[PDB]
Design a protein around this nucleic acid. Sequence first.
RNA 1: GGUUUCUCUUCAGAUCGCAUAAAUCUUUCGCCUUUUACUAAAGAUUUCCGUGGAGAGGAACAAUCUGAGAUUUUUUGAGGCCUUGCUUUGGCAAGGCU
Lengths: 97, 49, 78, 368, 49, 321, 68, 64
Amino acid sequence: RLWGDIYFNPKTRKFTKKAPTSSSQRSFVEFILEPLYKILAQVVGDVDTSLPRTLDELGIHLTKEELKLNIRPLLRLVCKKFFGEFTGFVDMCVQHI
Amino acid sequence: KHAVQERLAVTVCINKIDRLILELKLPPTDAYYKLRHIVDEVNGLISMY
Amino acid sequence: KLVRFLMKLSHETVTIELKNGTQVHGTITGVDVSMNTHLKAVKMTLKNREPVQLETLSIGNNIRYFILPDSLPLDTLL
Amino acid sequence: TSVIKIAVEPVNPSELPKMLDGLRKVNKSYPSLTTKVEESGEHVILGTGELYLDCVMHDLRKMYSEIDIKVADPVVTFCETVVETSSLKCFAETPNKKNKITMIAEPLEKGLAEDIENEVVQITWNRKKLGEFFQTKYDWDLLAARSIWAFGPDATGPNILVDDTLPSEVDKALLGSVKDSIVQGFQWGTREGPLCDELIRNVKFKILDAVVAQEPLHRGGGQIIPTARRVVYSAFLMATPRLMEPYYFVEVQAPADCVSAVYTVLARRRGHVTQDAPIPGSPLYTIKAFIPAIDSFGFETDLRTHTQGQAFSLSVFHHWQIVPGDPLDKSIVIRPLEPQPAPHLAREFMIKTRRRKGLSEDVSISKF
Amino acid sequence: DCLIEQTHPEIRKRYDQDLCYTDILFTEQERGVGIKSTPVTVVLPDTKG
Amino acid sequence: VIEPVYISQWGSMWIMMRREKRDRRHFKRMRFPPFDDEEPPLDYADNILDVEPLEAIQLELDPEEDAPVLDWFYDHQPLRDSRKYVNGSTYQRWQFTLPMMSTLYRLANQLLTDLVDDNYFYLFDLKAFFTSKALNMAIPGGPKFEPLVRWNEFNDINKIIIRQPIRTEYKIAFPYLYNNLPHHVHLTWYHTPNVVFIKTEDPDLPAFYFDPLINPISHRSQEPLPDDDEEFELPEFVEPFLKDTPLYTDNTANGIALLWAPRPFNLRSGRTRRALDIPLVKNWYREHCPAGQPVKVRVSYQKLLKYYVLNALKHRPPKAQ
Amino acid sequence: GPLSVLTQSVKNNTQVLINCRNNKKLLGRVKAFDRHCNMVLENVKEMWKDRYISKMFLRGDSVIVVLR
Amino acid sequence: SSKMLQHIDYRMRCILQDGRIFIGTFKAFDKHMNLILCDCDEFKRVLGLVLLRGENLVSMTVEG
RNA sequence: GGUUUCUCUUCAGAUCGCAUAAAUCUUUCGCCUUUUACUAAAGAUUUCCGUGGAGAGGAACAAUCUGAGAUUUUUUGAGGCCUUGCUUUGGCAAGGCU
């Protein structure tokens, strides 16, 4: 139900092929792309203000020395802690190769 | 073209999506449009070949 | 942990014994999160009778013991 | 296709076999690499591009051989073709003067060479299926569609052997008996090439007459093949042959302000822009163009130099075209170091390639 | 490199510069381009483990 | 010193020097020597200890725009007394925050490069200059050196086809291909991917916004969708992960611009360097000289590049000792 | 909790004998436990004569008692 | 809850908890393994369409 | 299960230093009456301005701080019972029971 012009109604909590209101994003934008945008924006812009609150909302805990890193290795560490090990590519090669 | 002509299974991964975010600063709907355009171009190339 | 090892050993041929005394040995094709499993080329031995070859056998939690194969290292899933 | 040709030489001749061993070593380490030894004694490496041959030559000079080595300037490998049909119905005969082969050569159509080379049609097909494939989209006669004997310098090569013999169809069992030797003569003749020892492409070889000796046996047991080679060379030479030069397809990714500067570089290198487009969702532009392969040496370096490194190009072998000159014009004088203009180009490539490997003089009736 | 760092625990990318595990020739290190294809045999888990 | 603070201070110095030379009617050089050869050296206590010093240069800052560096920008040791910024009074390591890092990056605008990648230095970097020195051949923009080392039938004029002449640049870019006897030659770095980074001017725009410089996508054959509302309604209390979090803040564009900042400005933390070890003008001669310049400054650019390459080439790792 | 960890340590260091509810006593090195009391044991001989098996996984519903 | 996809239309032989063996073509199954099978022929009797609970089915095998 | 600072010892194989000087020797150049002082390239070494890790001792400050830590399908009662051979006397293998 994620990809391909499917919209989400939180009132009915259901996925429709028609957009319920104007300026309503699709399910791939609202559920996948926008949290990725918010994660990268919170890392590269708000590394000291709202980053530990955002990491607590994602269930990600980092040490004090890990937050002292520069922005690219810290963002790599945050995405490695969030997404975990690489499993979608492995499942692609299992069920399509 | 060479993978179709060698008769192999073909899957596609889209690397460097952070260039849509950090580098290009696209809105996320336009990022979806770019990804769907990439997928449509690859499907058109496979259907042509 | 044990269900993870059962899902990890879902390729080789294994023997599963039910609670009713029925033992089936065959290649496991798919094992769910529960104890329900699907086996193929099953040389299932009947209860104190001869065995029969089954093309596809699907088993709730009626299986009591399962004989996992030898492909199990100390840190394969630990 | 590996088309860039580079000659290679040792500095000290006493270290001649050592780098030869290294040549075997680089033939072990690169799949598309081709190493030849010419009649002149030089050694020739064939590659696909400047970076590829640079990596091969660095691995030769630093890993598999410690010998200092001279490298010649890069050239390409050409092909040979025809434009108009054989004006004289040329012929030859066996050393046992009984069999007489008369055959003419004419060029093929547009899509035929790429249809053969992409294996759209094969010699393993049904004769009726091959005839239908020729007849539906090439409008061939069914007599001509059943006349196709063999393909090219190799299997699925871009030459077509067609046998159209009306007085020799009364002994067509004997024609089929000598057909295989005619096929290996055709394969050898189109593989070797009479002009500058290169491949022959896009030619239909049409047999007109075959006076075969009745039960030849002793004379039909090996004398047919060099006779057929001489027939192929003589029919090729009487049909105004041309040199056939490879072309590269170049895709350039550039910023928008540098694009016209890219055009300027192609203005020095006989190129033309096929298609200029903006990349959707990117601030860059894609310029797709065709260049000659001879003018492509250092095209990427000049493109990056004139655009402050912003424009970047990748280049790959696409197809062949004809050289604008004539290779057999004796009246063309060649300056020794000046870059020749367009009508002298085929004569210059002919003369320099024949001085590189073979004999300088060319005779149109050198066989017959 | 990401699959290797997931599999191998003590192999880590440096912070400033990119690790390149398969580019084992020094020509690929100096040029910064892949030249020779390299095989890697690895054991990987899926979403089901 | 902290390197971004030092570079920003000298950039502010550069701005007030340009403003002062634009605005002063008659700049007068001080004489040399300032004191005569029989004038005795002045006592410090009798002359200097009891007089008020004059003003420094000191670019005034905006209290709104340059707020997070406004307190400590012109101290000798800027944040040495603070504990959350520096390590202590030995003043070794520093950790900064991104808004004041963006403030320092804005303040150091005059002394910094505009490039975002190394693709500007294609045949104009250190490995290309090492190859150029080892082959005794030089680009006209680059430096010249002494030679390092001091019949062929390949040079036969009747066997060589010439369409384009083999220039120096192809002998540097592919040095094993176009050069007989290549010795002590370094292979240059190839292409790097182009940093397509868009610089935003006004802060009124959103941080994620379709710029007019980007070409439009203009997207114009069925998708394997499930049945509409057949099943699978979402349960209660599930949501996108950061729904309450906004998409972008005011610091997002500044942090994104700091991602592609130059070398001392893409850091959150670092070690303090000596004031001798910071060349403020190395990026000026490491790029090409601008057009329209006279002969004298182009020779100066070449000699600065020659000294830089000779420093980089003869460098050895330090011993233990 | 910790008693199950001590039982797993004893089954790693020695042979643990578990008597299931199906009148079978299996002695062997029990490797893994579970929240649903499922036991995975390595090189286990089950007597119900003792038959040897390499790896045995048993659900906790059929288990009755266990000891070192 | 996953075995119903592979045996959506093929006939299967089912073993109940009472020792009965039946053969019939399954149509649909519930999330708690409550499987509906038409033409469930008892092994000798015929019962037609019947729904079996999750705890009832001791074992199953593919017939058709 | 503190910080800061000072000194000493030991190990540096990291761009030990996102900077860069000088000196010695052996050769090649250039200037050239000769010698220093010189020109600028290579190779072999050193000194200096600095640096990182570990350990030890001292001083001044907070005196803790930072940690690790049940029944309703498939994990709990569909549980008991007579007979045949063994009884290996805790029961196993077979039938209708409830």
